[PDB]
Design a protein around this ligand. Structure first.
Ligand code: K
Ligand code: K
Ligand code: K
Ligand code: K
Ligand code: K
Ligand code: MG
Ligand code: MG
Ligand code: MG
Ligand code: MG
Ligand code: MG
Ligand code: MG
Ligand code: MG
Ligand code: MG
Ligand code: MG
Ligand code: MG
Ligand code: MG
Ligand code: MG
Ligand code: MG
Ligand code: MG
Ligand code: MG
Ligand code: MG
Ligand code: MG
Ligand code: MG
Ligand code: MG
Ligand code: MG
Ligand code: MG
Ligand code: MG
Ligand code: MG
Ligand code: MG
Ligand code: MG
Ligand code: MG
Ligand code: MG
Ligand code: MG
Ligand code: MG
Ligand code: MG
Ligand code: MG
Ligand code: MG
Ligand code: MG
Ligand code: MG
Ligand code: MG
Ligand code: MG
Ligand code: MG
Ligand code: MG
Ligand code: MG
Ligand code: MG
Ligand code: MG
Ligand code: MG
Ligand code: MG
Ligand code: MG
Ligand code: MG
Ligand code: MG
Ligand code: MG
Ligand code: MG
Ligand code: MG
Ligand code: MG
Ligand code: MG
Ligand code: MG
Ligand code: MG
Ligand code: MG
Ligand code: MG
Ligand code: MG
Ligand code: MG
Ligand code: MG
Ligand code: MG
Ligand code: MG
Ligand code: MG
Ligand code: MG
Ligand code: MG
Ligand code: MG
Ligand code: MG
Ligand code: MG
Ligand code: MG
Ligand code: MG
Ligand code: MG
Ligand code: MG
Ligand code: MG
Ligand code: MG
Ligand code: MG
Ligand code: MG
Ligand code: MG
Ligand code: MG
Ligand code: MG
Ligand code: MG
Ligand code: MG
Ligand code: MG
Ligand code: MG
Ligand code: MG
Ligand code: MG
Ligand code: MG
Ligand code: MG
Ligand code: MG
Ligand code: MG
Ligand code: MG
Ligand code: MG
Ligand code: MG
Ligand code: MG
Ligand code: MG
Ligand code: MG
Ligand code: MG
Ligand code: MG
Ligand code: MG
Ligand code: ZN
Ligand code: ZN
Lengths: 50, 252, 109, 84
RNA sequence: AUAUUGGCGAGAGACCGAUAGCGAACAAGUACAGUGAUGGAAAGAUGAAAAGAACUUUGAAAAGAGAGUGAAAAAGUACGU
RNA sequence: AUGGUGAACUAUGCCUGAAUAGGGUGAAGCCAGAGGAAACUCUGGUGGAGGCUCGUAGCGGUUCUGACGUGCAAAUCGAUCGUCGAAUUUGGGUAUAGGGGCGAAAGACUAAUCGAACCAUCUAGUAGCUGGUUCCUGCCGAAGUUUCCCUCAGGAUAGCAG
RNA sequence: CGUGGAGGUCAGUGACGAAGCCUAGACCGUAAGGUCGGGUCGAACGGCCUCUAGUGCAGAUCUUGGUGGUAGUAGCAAAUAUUCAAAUGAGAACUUUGAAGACUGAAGUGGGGAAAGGUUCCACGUCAACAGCAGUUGGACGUGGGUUAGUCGAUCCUAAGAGAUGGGGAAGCUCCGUUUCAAAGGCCUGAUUUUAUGCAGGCCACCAUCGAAAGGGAAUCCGGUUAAGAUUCCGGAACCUGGAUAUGGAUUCUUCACGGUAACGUAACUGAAUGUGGAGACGUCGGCGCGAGCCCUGGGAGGAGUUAUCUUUUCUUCUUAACAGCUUAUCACCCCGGAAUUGGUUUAUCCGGAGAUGGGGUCUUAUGGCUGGAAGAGGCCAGCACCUUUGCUGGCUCCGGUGCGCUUGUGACGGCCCGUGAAAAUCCACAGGAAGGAAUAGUUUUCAUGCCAGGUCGUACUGAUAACCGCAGCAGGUCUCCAAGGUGAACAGCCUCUAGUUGAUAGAAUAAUGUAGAUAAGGGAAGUCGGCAAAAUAGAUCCGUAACUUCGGGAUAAGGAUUGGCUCUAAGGGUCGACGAUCAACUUAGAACUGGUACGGACAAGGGGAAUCUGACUGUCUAAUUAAAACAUAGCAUUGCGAUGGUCAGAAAGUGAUGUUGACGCAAU
RNA sequence: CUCUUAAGGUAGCCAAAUGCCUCGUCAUCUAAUUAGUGACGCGCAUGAAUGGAUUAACGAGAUUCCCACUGUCCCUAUCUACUAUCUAGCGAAACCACAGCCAAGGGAACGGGCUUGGCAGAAUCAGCGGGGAAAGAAGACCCUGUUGAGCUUGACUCUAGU
RNA sequence: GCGUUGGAUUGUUCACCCACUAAUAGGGAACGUGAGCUGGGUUUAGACCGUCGUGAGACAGGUUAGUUUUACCCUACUGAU
RNA sequence: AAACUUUCAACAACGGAUCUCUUGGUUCUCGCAUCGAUGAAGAACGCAGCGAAAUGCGAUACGUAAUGUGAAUUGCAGAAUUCCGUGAAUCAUCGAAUCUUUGAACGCACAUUGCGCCCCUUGGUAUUCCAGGGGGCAUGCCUGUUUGAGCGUCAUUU
């Protein structure tokens, strides 16, 4: 809203920091059934609902 | 099958009075030693409009008898009361318009306003614009005063109950046609959400006892017993009689 | 012509969001937010505006010398000159009437 | 109206984040969380809501003290040191 | 002595074998929907071992054709059958 | 049925804000003039009233029963329209919650849900009613009739069959 | 007969290939099925005797998943519109740049914001997916950068209201109530200074807290700066709050100032408790006055355009912030004076012996003027140097006019109400006179200067025909500020400037039938349920206007006439000294002339009348098939009720609504 | 003159948005009128705040006539844009027992199939609305159910309140 | 074989009258024909009246308002390869 | 005769059935009794050389201390190979600590990373203003302590 509470900004900061693809050195680990970031969010597809 | 409008009014959610603009409760002074034994002189500082009320209020400032300060009181202005006028309240105050006197201290035939029902309740009777109480007599033994109320009822009150000499100002107000739904709107906007009123006969049966039917009609007698219950008491509750009033009032 | 914008985040034409349009030394038009105008202090007896007393928003009176807020008279920046004169006359005359009432009561007995 | 045009007027949150559970179930006007019941002392739960109890019950977090209570019991709530 | 679809620790089964069995064998009460109470999935399998295809060639590239690894590429991660 | 969740839509009250070209008409009050014995009357100006009016922005939604009707759209689009300074329009805050609210009243509205919202549980609710009911071959092989039933799309009973 | 699993057995089959799967190949059985060969494959499985069951599918608008025909089909057609060239690139209708043509046309397709979103902002790389064509581009993908405050908000205040406590109710979750049936108190200080506290002198309490990013509110502006931040950064210049404070000034020998008749003036010019007052603090409309910005415009100093011809021409720059000093109003007030021959006076008729007009003064400082800030800034130019940082060097940035103009602020008024149009925090002042005060000196941080500090959170961007909601990049919905020229009554329509966009899949044809827009001889509603649809009318000026009427209307009734262009004519003003001089803007009326008799030339823009039914009217509702005669309404009538009450709430309450009420009221019809 | 009621519909008004008969009768309106209007009234079944009668003004209300006006029509024609069409790219859905030429017959009494005839030649494109008793939805009407729900009432049985 | 009409009133089918005409015959085709239209009527939900009903409500009684969806498939037909 | 349609086969597709697997579930049995104001369960936000999650943890942050084992961890990087050692480890064990903001949640509030008060201490002359560090201030109830109130009331002086 550009006049946001610190709580909202903090959740926004966490979302920005976790908005990234899978680290590519994962998928080299020994067993590693993890293929991709299945929790990837985008502002155009799914709303954070705060 | 539904809770009717007069039943919903009791919850007081949207039916509370719109009291934001009001000046305060209109009351006599607290019945104290000065008024019980002598009189106290205050001064009328303002005659002001009260929202939702027809009669104007008078802000009367008295000296505090026990602490150096002023005590402002909100009286209902009697007709003829003016700003800068000295108001006298007490057993020994003079029979002058605007003075507050015990009912026993005024002669028979006196016209008073804002009359206490009990001594010290600070005003209950004849408070609406143009209304007044008439002293019709005293009973000194078992000290009481018989008075005529605006409704025509005769009441016996303690001779220590106070009233204000004169008639409540603003009289004749209901003599002007409102002429307009808009004027009724603005009248009730400052009183309460009781307007406009849908006729119960224009509703459905679920909404009102009078609702339903292939024509709009009550269907049963609109005179409803006093012993009826909530949801039934729509129409003429406990009517002694109906029809155009022909003849004289004041039964014996 | 040059069109201006509000400078605070309030976008509504409220009483505390009044703007004038000033031309800057940069040669451009710009909105300038203007405070709400002050009301003249008024007599406590008659309600007229008090002569000689400065007209500021309430808290600005603390940032100003006593001269701006008072008048050199018996009721300063509280009551007007005519109201104070009326108070003088009423006090004097009513005290005299009180003395003569006391004398009348003492000599009617 | 009442469909697509009326959905355009949805910009005022009835609920915001709850301090206790973080679920965005704190009713702004009621000042009450519809999920955990904050600010009531008890945590809202119902036996008709078995799935919700399962969602929020003990063990759904890290348990942070209780995960070690069991080992401490097994060792008898000892207090000293292992004494090389 | 009795109870115990919770907790902790164990031993089992003529039980089910990834549309079954708990909703969830997997970053499952997750992703996602709803203002909210709540609702709530899908999704296991290269190969013994990545040895996960060096190198050449055509193509802007993706890729193709070869070459090669491998027991098998009629196993090429779009992977057992 | 029990226990919960909703007034971000909308209904209504309250609190606090905001918004509404340009025209027509020309009410009180006021000025001058004329007439009259008087009571008073008349004329011209001024003025700028009204839940007045034409008509923008608004707000609404008549008719085309137009467009679309696998839509731009689970209600829109175009023209034509009602209204447009107060019972006006609207933001935010706030209150009212399900046999409850709210209703200038249509059983309307109460989050695409209303002649009783939504959510979960009771609950795999009951169904004389509809649909389905999964391998082969061999042998035997019907009844729609009797009596009774709040029975007449059902059952019991006897009969027919194994 | 077949299937999953179980006991026994065949010391059964099997990596030299179990199971599974495929196989118009073979055999057995009436059949359910069984067996074999071949291919594929890779780790288990079978015959028989028994045991056991979640044991056999074609259906259940069956469940889950997958897949078709339809079918390269329906379609990708609203929002005027694109074109040329170059660059980039593998590839260009769509990217970039340039050129052109257009549009939004200031009630924007512009510039900002609130809610919401949450990184979408910006840069670099970059096109697998997404952008219903494309894509080298992107709100995409990958990696990073980015949001700077004492002064802008939140924070503080209270509003409707929410809600602890004390108490009461409730089995209870909890409910009521918000100052109440409460022992609800800290902040001041003589003394105590065994210590500025306890005892011990004395002054004030009908009470938590939450509730506004649009209400109230301490204080900041200009210029510059970034890829992206700016009232936050930088430069300069201010201000407020809290504190500390020392000088100067002021005051005091008549201690707590002088002046003015007065209104009041000032650099100050003591002032506790307590009280009082003011500000905060308030509706709406109308005309009038004034200011600011904008619009228009003259001269001049610059730059640009046109120049066959004309145009001393067309466009453009010429600016001045917060803050500070001096000065400046309407209103109001004071002194003199005493007014009828009543005068003054507004557009609007109010004012005067309760003292007018007049003469002279006082005041608020909205606001304007000058100066400082501040020309050093910003703007417009010119002349040089340039592998760069870029360097510079100069000049000018001036003086006016105008108004029913627009936007806005404001003042004095006027109209309106049975409507009279918040509260609190906070700040100030007064009354009072507690106390404290001077003479090799006391007093004064409301005068000046000087010193220190001002925390926390937000701050990017969009705000929508793509950043919100509507399943989406959806023709829907979603609050608000600013607002240029012309025509015109006009924020109408139409065209244009600044700014922005040129985005909607395209190319080629031009059948039917459509959707949207139009025209039509003669007739003129014969069509049709019905004039549905369409047409006709339309602006302004002048004339003329009926029935009926509640006398207000009806009414733009009806019905007519005129309207362009051009050249003139007349009338309506300001300032200054019966006139003279000077200056200025439009509105109205008329005349001649003129023309393919056109002229509200586009745009814009009533059809009218005679009646009947019905509802008085304005207003309201079935969001999404009904706008009506339905509802409401004012008016009328009836009913209940005098508070230990009427009506209505609550499970109960030491509980509520009406009620901050009182019969001219509330409640029910 | 009777029977008779609580009272017997008064003032008004009417084939009216209330009149069955009924397109009532008379008049007017027209060439022609189940329409409109004005009258009449033993009025199935008009009528007095369940308001009667009337009413200026107002009305996106219902209706009749007239003038104007017109493609509503006689009776159609033509033009423009965008589609449709063809192409490059992109690319769904409804629906689908199997499918798709008729006539008659019989048949669950209206066949695409069956019988008897007629016939019958690949693959197709644009249109079209006869048929597919086309699609959309377990008919909303009707009936049945010992299935409900909304609403009402001296139904049965209760209940808050009082 | 060939034609069998234009109108006033009414949703109307029917009827009735005006009028022209050679004549203004009767009928069928799912009482032909609504993915051909229209929607005046009937026949949802709004509303008014009359009679009936205590009432909610009823009325082959009257009155006013009231969303008419889809073809691109197969055949048939019209044209066209 | 092609094309086209249909049927079958082979190979290739589409799709993910079948078969075989199984650190999962389900049911039965046996044993045990241990959450929290010494702040629980739950929540938010952070923490790694390179992590978005799961898991672990709390500014001592995929952990510190202690004990045991005895040489790893591993995807890369780095370190180390003394590793015959108080010593690797994403080991096990776990008795000592840390334990942000919260939460019954406790100074008052909380749609605020809002607002106080007390003590010690540090800096800015500083008891008073501002700031930094540390430690505290909820309610009900119980026992006790201290200070009090009430002509409720006793005694003494009077
Ligand atoms: K009413
Ligand atoms: K009724
Ligand atoms: K002064
Ligand atoms: K409009
Ligand atoms: K129902
Ligand atoms: Mg009424
Ligand atoms: Mg109704
Ligand atoms: Mg009822
Ligand atoms: Mg009743
Ligand atoms: Mg009705
Ligand atoms: Mg002054
Ligand atoms: Mg709804
Ligand atoms: Mg809300
Ligand atoms: Mg599963
Ligand atoms: Mg697999
Ligand atoms: Mg193999
Ligand atoms: Mg709301
Ligand atoms: Mg109008
Ligand atoms: Mg529309
Ligand atoms: Mg339509
Ligand atoms: Mg269509
Ligand atoms: Mg109804
Ligand atoms: Mg069952
Ligand atoms: Mg047999
Ligand atoms: Mg029986
Ligand atoms: Mg049957
Ligand atoms: Mg089994
Ligand atoms: Mg094999
Ligand atoms: Mg086969
Ligand atoms: Mg294997
Ligand atoms: Mg089974
Ligand atoms: Mg099957
Ligand atoms: Mg079957
Ligand atoms: Mg099926
Ligand atoms: Mg399926
Ligand atoms: Mg196509
Ligand atoms: Mg289309
Ligand atoms: Mg277009
Ligand atoms: Mg370009
Ligand atoms: Mg345009
Ligand atoms: Mg344009
Ligand atoms: Mg960008
Ligand atoms: Mg594309
Ligand atoms: Mg592409
Ligand atoms: Mg990005
Ligand atoms: Mg501020
Ligand atoms: Mg409470
Ligand atoms: Mg607050
Ligand atoms: Mg504010
Ligand atoms: Mg910016
Ligand atoms: Mg600075
Ligand atoms: Mg002096
Ligand atoms: Mg004077
Ligand atoms: Mg100023
Ligand atoms: Mg404005
Ligand atoms: Mg910004
Ligand atoms: Mg922005
Ligand atoms: Mg914008
Ligand atoms: Mg969206
Ligand atoms: Mg003009
Ligand atoms: Mg014609
Ligand atoms: Mg013609
Ligand atoms: Mg004609
Ligand atoms: Mg006709
Ligand atoms: Mg006809
Ligand atoms: Mg007709
Ligand atoms: Mg029309
Ligand atoms: Mg006319
Ligand atoms: Mg007329
Ligand atoms: Mg009406
Ligand atoms: Mg009006
Ligand atoms: Mg509707
Ligand atoms: Mg409608
Ligand atoms: Mg009515
Ligand atoms: Mg009669
Ligand atoms: Mg009649
Ligand atoms: Mg008639
Ligand atoms: Mg006719
Ligand atoms: Mg009567
Ligand atoms: Mg009647
Ligand atoms: Mg109207
Ligand atoms: Mg046939
Ligand atoms: Mg037959
Ligand atoms: Mg068939
Ligand atoms: Mg045949
Ligand atoms: Mg053929
Ligand atoms: Mg068709
Ligand atoms: Mg057909
Ligand atoms: Mg059925
Ligand atoms: Mg059904
Ligand atoms: Mg039965
Ligand atoms: Mg029932
Ligand atoms: Mg038919
Ligand atoms: Mg048909
Ligand atoms: Mg149809
Ligand atoms: Mg038909
Ligand atoms: Mg109809
Ligand atoms: Mg109906
Ligand atoms: Mg009746
Ligand atoms: Mg019927
Ligand atoms: Mg902790
Ligand atoms: Zn005064
Ligand atoms: Zn919660």
């Amino acid at each position: 809203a550009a006049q946001k509470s610190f709580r909202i900004k903090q959740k926004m900061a966490k979302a920005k920091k976790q908005n990234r693809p899978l680290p590519q050195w994962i998928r080299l680990r020994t067993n590693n059934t993890i293929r991709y970031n299945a929790k990837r969010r985008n502002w155009r597809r799914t709303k954070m609902n705060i | 099958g539904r809770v009717i409008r007069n039943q919903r009014k009791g919850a007081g959610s949207i039916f509370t009075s719109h009291t934001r603009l009001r000046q305060g409760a209109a009351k006599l002074r607290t019945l104290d030693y000065a008024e019980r034994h002598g009189y106290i002189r205050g001064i009328v500082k303002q005659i002001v409009h009260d929202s939702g009320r027809g009669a104007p209020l008078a802000k009367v400032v008295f000296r505090d008898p026990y602490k150096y300060r002023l005590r402002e009181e909100i009286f209902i202005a009697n007709e003829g009361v003016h700003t800068g006028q000295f108001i006298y309240a007490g057993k020994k105050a003079s029979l002058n318009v605007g003075n507050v006197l015990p009912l026993g201290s005024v002669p028979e035939g006196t016209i008073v306003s804002n009359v206490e029902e009990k001594p010290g309740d600070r005003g209950a009777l004849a408070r609406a614009s143009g209304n007044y109480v008439i002293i019709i007599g005293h009973n000194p033994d078992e000290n009481k005063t018989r008075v005529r109320l605006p409704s025509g009822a005769k009441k016996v009150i303690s001779s220590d109950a106070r009233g204000v000499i004169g008639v409540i100002a603003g009289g004749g107000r209901v003599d002007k046609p409102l002429l307009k739904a808009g004027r009724a709107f603005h009248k009730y906007r400052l009183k309460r959400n009781s307007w406009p009123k849908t006729r119960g006969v224009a509703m459905n049966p679920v909404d009102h006892p009078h609702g339903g039917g292939n024509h709009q009609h009550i269907g049963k007698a609109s005179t409803i017993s006093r012993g009826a219950v909530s949801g039934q008491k729509a129409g003429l509750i406990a009517a002694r009689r109906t029809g155009l009033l022909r003849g004289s009032q004041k039964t014996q | 012509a040059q069109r201006v914008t509000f400078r605070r985040r309030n976008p509504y034409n409220t009483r505390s969001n009044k703007i004038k349009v000033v031309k800057t030394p940069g040669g451009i038009l710009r909105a300038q937010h203007v405070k709400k105008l002050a009301t003249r202090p008024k007599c406590g007896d008659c309600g007229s505006a008090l002569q000689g007393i400065s007209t500021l928003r309430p808290r600005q009176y603390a940032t100003v010398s006593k001269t701006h807020k008072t008048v050199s008279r018996a009721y300063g920046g509280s009551r007007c000159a005519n109201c104070v004169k009326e108070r003088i006359i009423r006090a004097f005359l009513i005290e005299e009437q009180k003395i003569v009432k006391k004398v009348v009561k003492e000599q009617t007995e | 109206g009442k469909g697509t045009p009326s959905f355009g007027k949805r910009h005022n949150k009835s609920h915001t984040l709850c301090n206790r559970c973080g679920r965005r179930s704190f009713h702004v006007q009621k000042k009450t969380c519809s999920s955990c019941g904050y600010p009531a002392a008890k945590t809202r739960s119902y036996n008709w809501g078995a799935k919700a109890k399962r969602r929020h019950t003990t063990g759904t977090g890290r348990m942070r003290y209780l995960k070690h209570v069991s080992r401490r019991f097994k060792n008898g709530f000892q207090t000293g040191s292992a004494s090389k």
